[PDB]
mmCIF file of C-alpha atoms and ligand atoms in Angstrom:
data_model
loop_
_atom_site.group_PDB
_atom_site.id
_atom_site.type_symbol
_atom_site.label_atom_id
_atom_site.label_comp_id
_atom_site.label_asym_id
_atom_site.label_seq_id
_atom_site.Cartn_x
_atom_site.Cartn_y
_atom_site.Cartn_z
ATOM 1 C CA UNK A 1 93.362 21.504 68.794
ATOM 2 C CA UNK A 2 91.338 24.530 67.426
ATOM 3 C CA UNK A 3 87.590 24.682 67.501
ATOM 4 C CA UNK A 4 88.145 24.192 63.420
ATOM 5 C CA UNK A 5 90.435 21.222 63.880
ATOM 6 C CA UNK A 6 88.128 19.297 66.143
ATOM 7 C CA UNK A 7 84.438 20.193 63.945
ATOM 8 C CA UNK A 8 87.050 18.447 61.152
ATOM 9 C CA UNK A 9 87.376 15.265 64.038
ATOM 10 C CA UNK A 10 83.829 15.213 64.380
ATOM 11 C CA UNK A 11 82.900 15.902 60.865
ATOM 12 C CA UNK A 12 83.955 12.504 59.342
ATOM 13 C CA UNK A 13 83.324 10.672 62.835
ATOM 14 C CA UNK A 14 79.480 11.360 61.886
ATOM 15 C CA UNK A 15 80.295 9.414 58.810
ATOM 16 C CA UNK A 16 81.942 6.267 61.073
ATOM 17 C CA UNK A 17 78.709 6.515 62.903
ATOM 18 C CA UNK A 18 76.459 6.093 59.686
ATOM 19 C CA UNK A 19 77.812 1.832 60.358
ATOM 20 C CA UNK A 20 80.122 1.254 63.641
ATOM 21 C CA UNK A 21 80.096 -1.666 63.311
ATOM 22 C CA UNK A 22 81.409 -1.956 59.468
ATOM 23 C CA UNK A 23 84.039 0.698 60.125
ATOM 24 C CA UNK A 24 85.274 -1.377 63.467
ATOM 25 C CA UNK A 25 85.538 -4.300 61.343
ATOM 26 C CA UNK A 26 87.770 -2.861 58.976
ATOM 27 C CA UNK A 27 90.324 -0.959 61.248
ATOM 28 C CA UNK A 28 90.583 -3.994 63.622
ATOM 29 C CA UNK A 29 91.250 -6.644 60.206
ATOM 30 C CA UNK A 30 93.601 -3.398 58.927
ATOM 31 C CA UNK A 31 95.487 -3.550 62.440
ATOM 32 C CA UNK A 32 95.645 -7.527 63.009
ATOM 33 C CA UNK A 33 96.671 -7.611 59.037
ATOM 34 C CA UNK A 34 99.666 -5.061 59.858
ATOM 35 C CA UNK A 35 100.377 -5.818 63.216
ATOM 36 C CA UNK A 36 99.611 -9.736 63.656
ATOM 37 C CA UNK A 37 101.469 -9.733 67.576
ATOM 38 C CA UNK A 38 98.224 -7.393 68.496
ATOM 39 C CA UNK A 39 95.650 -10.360 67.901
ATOM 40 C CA UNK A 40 97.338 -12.062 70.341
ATOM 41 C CA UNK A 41 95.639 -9.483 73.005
ATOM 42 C CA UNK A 42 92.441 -11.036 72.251
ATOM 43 C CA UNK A 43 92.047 -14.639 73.712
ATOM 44 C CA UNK A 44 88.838 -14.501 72.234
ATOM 45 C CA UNK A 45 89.172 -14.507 68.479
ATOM 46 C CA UNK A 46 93.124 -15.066 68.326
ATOM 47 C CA UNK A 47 93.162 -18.058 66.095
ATOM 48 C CA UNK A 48 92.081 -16.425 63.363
ATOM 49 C CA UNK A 49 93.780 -16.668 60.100
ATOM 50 C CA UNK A 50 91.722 -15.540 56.970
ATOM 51 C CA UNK A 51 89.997 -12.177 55.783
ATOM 52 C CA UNK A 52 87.230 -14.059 55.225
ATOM 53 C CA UNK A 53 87.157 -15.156 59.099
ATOM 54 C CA UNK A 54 87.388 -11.942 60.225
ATOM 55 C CA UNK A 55 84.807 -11.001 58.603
ATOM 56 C CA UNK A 56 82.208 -13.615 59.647
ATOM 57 C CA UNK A 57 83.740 -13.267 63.562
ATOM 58 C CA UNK A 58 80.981 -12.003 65.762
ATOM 59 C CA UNK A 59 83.432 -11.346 68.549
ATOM 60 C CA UNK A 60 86.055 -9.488 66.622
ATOM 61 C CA UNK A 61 82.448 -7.149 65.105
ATOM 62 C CA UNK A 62 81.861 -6.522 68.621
ATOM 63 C CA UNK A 63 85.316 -6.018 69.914
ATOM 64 C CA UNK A 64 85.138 -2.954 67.090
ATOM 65 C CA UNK A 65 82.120 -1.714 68.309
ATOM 66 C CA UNK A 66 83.240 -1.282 71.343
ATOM 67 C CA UNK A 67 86.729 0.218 70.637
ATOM 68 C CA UNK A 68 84.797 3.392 68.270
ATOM 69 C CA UNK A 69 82.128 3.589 70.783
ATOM 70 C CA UNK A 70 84.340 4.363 72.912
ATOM 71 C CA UNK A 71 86.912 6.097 71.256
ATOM 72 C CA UNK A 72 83.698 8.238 69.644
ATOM 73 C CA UNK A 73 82.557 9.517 73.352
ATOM 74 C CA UNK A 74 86.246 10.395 73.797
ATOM 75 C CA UNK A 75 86.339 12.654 70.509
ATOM 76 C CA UNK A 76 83.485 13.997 71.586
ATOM 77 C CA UNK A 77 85.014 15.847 74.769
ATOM 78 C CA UNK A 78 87.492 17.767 72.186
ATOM 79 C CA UNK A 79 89.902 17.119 75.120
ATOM 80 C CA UNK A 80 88.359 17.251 78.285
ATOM 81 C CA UNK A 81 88.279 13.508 78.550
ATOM 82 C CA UNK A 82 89.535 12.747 82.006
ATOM 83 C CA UNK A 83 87.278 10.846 83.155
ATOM 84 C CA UNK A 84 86.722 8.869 80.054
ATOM 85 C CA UNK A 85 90.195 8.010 80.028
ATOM 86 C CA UNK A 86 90.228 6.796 83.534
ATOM 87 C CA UNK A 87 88.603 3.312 83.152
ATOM 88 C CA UNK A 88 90.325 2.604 80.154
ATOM 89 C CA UNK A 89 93.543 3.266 81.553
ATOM 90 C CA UNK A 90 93.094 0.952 84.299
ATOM 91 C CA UNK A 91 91.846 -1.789 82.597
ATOM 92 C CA UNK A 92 94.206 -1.116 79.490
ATOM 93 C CA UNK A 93 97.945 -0.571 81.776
ATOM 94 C CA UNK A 94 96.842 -3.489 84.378
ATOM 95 C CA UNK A 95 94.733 -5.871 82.543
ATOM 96 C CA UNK A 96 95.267 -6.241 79.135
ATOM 97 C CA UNK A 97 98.789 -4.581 79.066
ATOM 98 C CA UNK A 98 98.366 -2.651 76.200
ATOM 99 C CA UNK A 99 101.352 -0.484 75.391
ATOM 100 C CA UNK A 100 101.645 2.838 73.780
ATOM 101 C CA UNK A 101 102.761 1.742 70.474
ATOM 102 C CA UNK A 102 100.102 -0.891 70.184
ATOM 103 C CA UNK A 103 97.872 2.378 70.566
ATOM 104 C CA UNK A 104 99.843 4.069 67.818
ATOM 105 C CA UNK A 105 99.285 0.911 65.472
ATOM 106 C CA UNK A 106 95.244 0.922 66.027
ATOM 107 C CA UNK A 107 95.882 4.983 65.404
ATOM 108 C CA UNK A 108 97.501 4.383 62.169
ATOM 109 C CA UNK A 109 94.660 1.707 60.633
ATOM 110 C CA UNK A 110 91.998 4.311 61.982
ATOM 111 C CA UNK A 111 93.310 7.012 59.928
ATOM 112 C CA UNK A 112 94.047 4.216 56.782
ATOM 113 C CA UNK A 113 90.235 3.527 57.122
ATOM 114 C CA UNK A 114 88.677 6.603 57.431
ATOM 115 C CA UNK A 115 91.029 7.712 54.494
ATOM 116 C CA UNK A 116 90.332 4.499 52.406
ATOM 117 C CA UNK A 117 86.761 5.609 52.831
ATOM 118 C CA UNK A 118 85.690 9.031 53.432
ATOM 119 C CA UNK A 119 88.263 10.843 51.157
ATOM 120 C CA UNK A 120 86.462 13.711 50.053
ATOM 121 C CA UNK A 121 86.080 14.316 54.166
ATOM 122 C CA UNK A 122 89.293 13.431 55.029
ATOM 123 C CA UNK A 123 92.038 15.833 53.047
ATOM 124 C CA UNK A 124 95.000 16.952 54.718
ATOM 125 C CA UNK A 125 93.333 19.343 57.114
ATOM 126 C CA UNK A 126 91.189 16.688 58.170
ATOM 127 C CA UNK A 127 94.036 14.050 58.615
ATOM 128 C CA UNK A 128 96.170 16.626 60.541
ATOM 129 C CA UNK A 129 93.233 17.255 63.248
ATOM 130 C CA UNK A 130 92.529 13.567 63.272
ATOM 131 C CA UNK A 131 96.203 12.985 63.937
ATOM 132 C CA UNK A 132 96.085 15.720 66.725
ATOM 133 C CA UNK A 133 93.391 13.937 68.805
ATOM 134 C CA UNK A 134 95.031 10.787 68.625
ATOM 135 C CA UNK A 135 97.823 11.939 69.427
ATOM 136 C CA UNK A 136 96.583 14.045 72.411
ATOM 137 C CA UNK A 137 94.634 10.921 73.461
ATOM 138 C CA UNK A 138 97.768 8.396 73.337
ATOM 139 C CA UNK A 139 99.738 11.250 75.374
ATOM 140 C CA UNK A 140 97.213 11.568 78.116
ATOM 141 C CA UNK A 141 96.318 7.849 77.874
ATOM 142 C CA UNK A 142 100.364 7.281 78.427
ATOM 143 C CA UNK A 143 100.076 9.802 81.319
ATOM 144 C CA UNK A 144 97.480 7.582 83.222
ATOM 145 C CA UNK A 145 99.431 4.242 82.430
ATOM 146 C CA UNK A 146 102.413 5.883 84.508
ATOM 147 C CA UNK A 147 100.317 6.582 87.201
ATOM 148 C CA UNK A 148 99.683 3.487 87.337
ATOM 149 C CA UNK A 149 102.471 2.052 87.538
ATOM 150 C CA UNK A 150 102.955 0.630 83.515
ATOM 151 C CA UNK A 151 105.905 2.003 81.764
ATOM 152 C CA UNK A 152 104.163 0.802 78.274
HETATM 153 C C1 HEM B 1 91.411 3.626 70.434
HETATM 154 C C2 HEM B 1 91.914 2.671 71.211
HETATM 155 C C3 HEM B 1 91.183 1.788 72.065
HETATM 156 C C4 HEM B 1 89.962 1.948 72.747
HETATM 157 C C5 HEM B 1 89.136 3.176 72.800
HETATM 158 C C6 HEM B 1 89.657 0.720 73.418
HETATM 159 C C7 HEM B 1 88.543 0.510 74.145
HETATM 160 C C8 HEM B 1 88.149 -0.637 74.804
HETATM 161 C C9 HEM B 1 87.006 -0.840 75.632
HETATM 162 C C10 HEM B 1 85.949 0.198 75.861
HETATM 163 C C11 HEM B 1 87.077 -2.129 76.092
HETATM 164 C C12 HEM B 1 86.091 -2.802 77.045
HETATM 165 C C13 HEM B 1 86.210 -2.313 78.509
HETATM 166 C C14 HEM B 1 87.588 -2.486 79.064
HETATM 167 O O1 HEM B 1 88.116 -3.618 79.145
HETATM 168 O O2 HEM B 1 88.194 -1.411 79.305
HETATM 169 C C15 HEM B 1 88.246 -2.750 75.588
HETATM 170 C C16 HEM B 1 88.764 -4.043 75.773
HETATM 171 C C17 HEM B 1 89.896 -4.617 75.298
HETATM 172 N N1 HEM B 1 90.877 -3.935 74.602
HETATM 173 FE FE1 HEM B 1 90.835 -2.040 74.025
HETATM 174 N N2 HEM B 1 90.681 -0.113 73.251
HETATM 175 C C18 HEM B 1 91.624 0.406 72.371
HETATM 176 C C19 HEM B 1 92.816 -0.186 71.874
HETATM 177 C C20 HEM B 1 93.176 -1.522 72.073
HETATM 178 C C21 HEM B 1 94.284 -2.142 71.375
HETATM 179 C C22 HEM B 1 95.183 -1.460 70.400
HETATM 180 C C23 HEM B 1 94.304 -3.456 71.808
HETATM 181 C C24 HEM B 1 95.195 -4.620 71.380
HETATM 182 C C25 HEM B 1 96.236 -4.549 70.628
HETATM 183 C C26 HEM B 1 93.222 -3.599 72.795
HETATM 184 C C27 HEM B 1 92.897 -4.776 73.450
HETATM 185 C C28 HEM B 1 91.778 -4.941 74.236
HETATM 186 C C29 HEM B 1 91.429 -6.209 74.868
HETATM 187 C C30 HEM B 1 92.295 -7.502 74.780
HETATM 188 C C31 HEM B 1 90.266 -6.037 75.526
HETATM 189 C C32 HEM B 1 89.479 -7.040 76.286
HETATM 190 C C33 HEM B 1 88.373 -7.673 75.466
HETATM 191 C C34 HEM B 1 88.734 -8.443 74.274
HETATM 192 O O3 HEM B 1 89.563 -9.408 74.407
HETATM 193 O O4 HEM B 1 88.211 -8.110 73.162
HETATM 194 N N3 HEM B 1 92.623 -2.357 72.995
HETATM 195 N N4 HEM B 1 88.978 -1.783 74.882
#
């Protein structure tokens, strides 16, 4: 990405950060609401069946925290994210056996949210860059699966 691209990245990530937890909420519901076989993942809060539920879940809050919180210290590398890639892509190819396009579906309700939101931060330029670095982080993320032995 250019230096522009990624201050555009980080520019409406400081508005994520404003509420994590609010933001996590609503791209996990988005992605369990378009993609119902990715609940499954989460033995957790899997029965789940209602909005509403989702909502009040304090396990599915948390599980969102944790995704952006990471996913936010990733951003923040603008690419150099090696090592904050590795333990994810251990416990992500040979735990929880999360494939690639499962990433792409949490990419696309990220970039519905932040859009559905943040508008006035997130025109096309900003939607291109945000695109970029998810894209750059499902490539290298896909890279370390391999390694690993998982083809997903
Ligand atoms: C931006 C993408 C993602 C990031 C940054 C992320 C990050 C994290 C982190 C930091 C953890 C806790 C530590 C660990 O187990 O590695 C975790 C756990 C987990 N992740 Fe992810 N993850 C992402 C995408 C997904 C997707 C798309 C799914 C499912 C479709 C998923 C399923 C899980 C599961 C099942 C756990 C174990 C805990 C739980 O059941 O809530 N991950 N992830």
């Amino acid at each position: 990405l250019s230096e522009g691209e990624w201050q555009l990245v980080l520019h409406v990530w400081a508005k994520v950060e404003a509420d994590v937890a609010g933001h996590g909420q609503d791209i996990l519901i988005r992605l369990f609401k378009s993609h119902p076989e990715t609940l499954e993942k989460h033995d957790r809060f899997k029965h789940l069946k209602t909005e509403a539920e989702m909502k009040a879940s304090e396990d599915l809050k948390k599980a969102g925290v944790t995704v952006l919180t990471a996913l936010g210290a990733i951003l923040k590398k603008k690419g150099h994210h090696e090592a904050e890639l590795k333990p994810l892509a251990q416990s992500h190819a040979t735990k929880h056996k999360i494939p690639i396009k499962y990433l792409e579906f949490i990419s696309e309700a990220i970039i519905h949210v932040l859009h559905s939101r943040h508008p006035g931060d997130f025109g096309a330029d900003a939607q291109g860059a945000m695109n970029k670095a998810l894209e750059l982080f499902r490539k290298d993320i896909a890279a370390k699966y391999k390694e690993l032995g998982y083809q997903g």
